[PDB]
Write an enzyme that holds these catalytic residues in place. Structure first.
Site, short mmCIF file in Angstrom:
data_model
loop_
_atom_site.label_atom_id
_atom_site.label_comp_id
_atom_site.label_asym_id
_atom_site.label_seq_id
_atom_site.Cartn_x
_atom_site.Cartn_y
_atom_site.Cartn_z
N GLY A 1 -36.92 43.48 -0.59
CA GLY A 1 -35.79 44.22 0.31
C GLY A 1 -35.45 42.83 1.18
O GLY A 1 -35.38 41.72 0.83
N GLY B 1 -35.37 40.24 3.89
CA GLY B 1 -36.30 39.26 4.41
C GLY B 1 -37.70 39.01 3.81
O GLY B 1 -37.87 39.38 2.52
N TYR C 1 -41.91 40.66 0.24
CA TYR C 1 -40.59 40.05 -0.17
C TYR C 1 -39.68 41.16 -0.56
O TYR C 1 -38.40 40.69 -0.25
CB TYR C 1 -40.61 38.86 -0.65
CG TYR C 1 -41.05 37.71 0.09
CD1 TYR C 1 -42.58 37.51 -0.11
CD2 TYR C 1 -40.28 36.84 0.78
CE1 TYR C 1 -43.21 36.43 0.84
CE2 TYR C 1 -40.82 36.02 1.52
CZ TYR C 1 -42.40 35.56 1.53
OH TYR C 1 -42.86 34.67 2.42
N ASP D 1 -30.03 36.67 -10.17
CA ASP D 1 -29.99 38.24 -10.18
C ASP D 1 -30.51 38.57 -11.35
O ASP D 1 -31.52 39.51 -11.55
CB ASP D 1 -28.63 38.66 -10.20
CG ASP D 1 -28.44 38.68 -8.46
OD1 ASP D 1 -29.01 37.89 -7.72
OD2 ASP D 1 -27.22 39.00 -8.10
N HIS E 1 -36.51 35.23 -5.90
CA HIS E 1 -35.15 35.59 -5.73
C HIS E 1 -34.44 35.24 -4.44
O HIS E 1 -33.45 34.60 -4.45
CB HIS E 1 -34.99 36.96 -5.79
CG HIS E 1 -33.47 37.78 -5.92
ND1 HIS E 1 -33.15 38.56 -4.70
CD2 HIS E 1 -32.63 37.59 -6.79
CE1 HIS E 1 -32.11 38.55 -5.31
NE2 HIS E 1 -31.61 38.27 -6.27
N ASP E 2 -35.25 35.35 -3.34
CA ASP E 2 -34.88 34.80 -2.18
C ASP E 2 -34.78 33.44 -2.31
O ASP E 2 -33.88 32.71 -1.38
CB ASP E 2 -36.23 35.22 -0.93
CG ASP E 2 -35.78 36.59 -0.56
OD1 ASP E 2 -34.96 37.43 -0.97
OD2 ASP E 2 -36.87 37.18 0.06
N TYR F 1 -19.08 37.74 -10.04
CA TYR F 1 -19.17 37.17 -11.42
C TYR F 1 -19.12 38.13 -12.67
O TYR F 1 -18.97 39.08 -12.51
CB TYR F 1 -20.70 36.39 -11.25
CG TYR F 1 -21.81 37.18 -11.06
CD1 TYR F 1 -22.17 37.62 -9.74
CD2 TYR F 1 -22.59 37.81 -12.07
CE1 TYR F 1 -23.27 38.24 -9.31
CE2 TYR F 1 -23.69 38.72 -11.55
CZ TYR F 1 -23.96 38.96 -10.44
OH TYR F 1 -25.21 39.66 -10.08
N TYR G 1 -31.59 32.52 -3.91
CA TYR G 1 -30.31 32.61 -3.04
C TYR G 1 -30.32 31.61 -2.04
O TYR G 1 -29.17 31.27 -1.66
CB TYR G 1 -30.45 33.96 -2.36
CG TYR G 1 -29.76 34.96 -3.34
CD1 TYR G 1 -29.57 35.12 -4.52
CD2 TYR G 1 -29.34 36.22 -2.51
CE1 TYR G 1 -29.18 36.07 -5.17
CE2 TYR G 1 -28.90 37.24 -3.05
CZ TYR G 1 -28.50 37.25 -4.56
OH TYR G 1 -28.20 38.17 -5.35
NA NA Z 1 -36.44 39.80 0.64
#
Ligand code: NA
Ligand code: NA
Lengths: 120, 61
Positions: A30, A32, A28, A94, A48-49, A68, A52
């Protein structure tokens, strides 16, 4: 906002390392992803994905561009956003990812891994 | 990242190889300074460069 994320990573990963070593790691880290995160550090990117994704849908924000307030000090990071706004939601995605990156074992063997083989 | 645990120990100047220029952190100056590193690695307060050294040792207040 990509630029802030990188700023954040640049500040928590060990000194000897660099952003590129985190750009294409595991399943994961990077652009996609697929499969399941192969190790601890990949898990950071996976969560993190996810974050998001929950911000774009459940909260209608554009994560990769969201502006932000974040402060880097004492080897840590602090989000000042209003506890509820999208810029705050996103900052937290983040921040915890950056903090996750610094505290995770960076397995050399998992960088640039074969996707078709290890991510099914 | 965390602060290098050896940032306040004295730099290891003993000789175990040909000498090279490295930087170590000096607590009584809140700076990294250049020194003659001999490769004995008695401690890790020795870095290829100033940037790397600040990175590893600069005290955030
Ligand atoms: Na990713
Ligand atoms: Na790992």
């Amino acid at each position: 906002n990509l630029i802030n994320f990188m700023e954040m990573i640049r500040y928590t990963i060990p000194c000897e390392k660099t952003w590129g070593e985190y750009a294409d790691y595991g399943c994961y880290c990077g652009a996609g992803g697929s499969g399941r995160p192969i190790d601890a550090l990949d898990r950071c990117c996976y969560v993190h994905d996810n974050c998001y994704g929950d911000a774009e849908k459940k909260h209608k924000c554009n994560p990769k561009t969201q502006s932000y307030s974040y402060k880097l000090t004492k080897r840590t990071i602090i989000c000042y956003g209003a506890a509820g706004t999208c810029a705050r939601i996103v900052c937290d995605c983040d921040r915890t990812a950056a903090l996750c990156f610094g505290n995770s074992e960076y397995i050399e063997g998992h960088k640039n891994i074969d996707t078709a083989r290890f991510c099914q | 990242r965390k602060r290098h645990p050896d940032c306040d120990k004295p730099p290891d100047t003993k000789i175990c190889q040909t000498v090279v220029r490295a930087f170590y952190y000096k607590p009584s100056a809140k700076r990294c300074v250049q020194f003659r590193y001999g490769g004995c690695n008695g401690n890790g307060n020795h870095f290829k460069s100033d940037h790397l050294c600040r990175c590893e040792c600069l005290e955030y207040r």
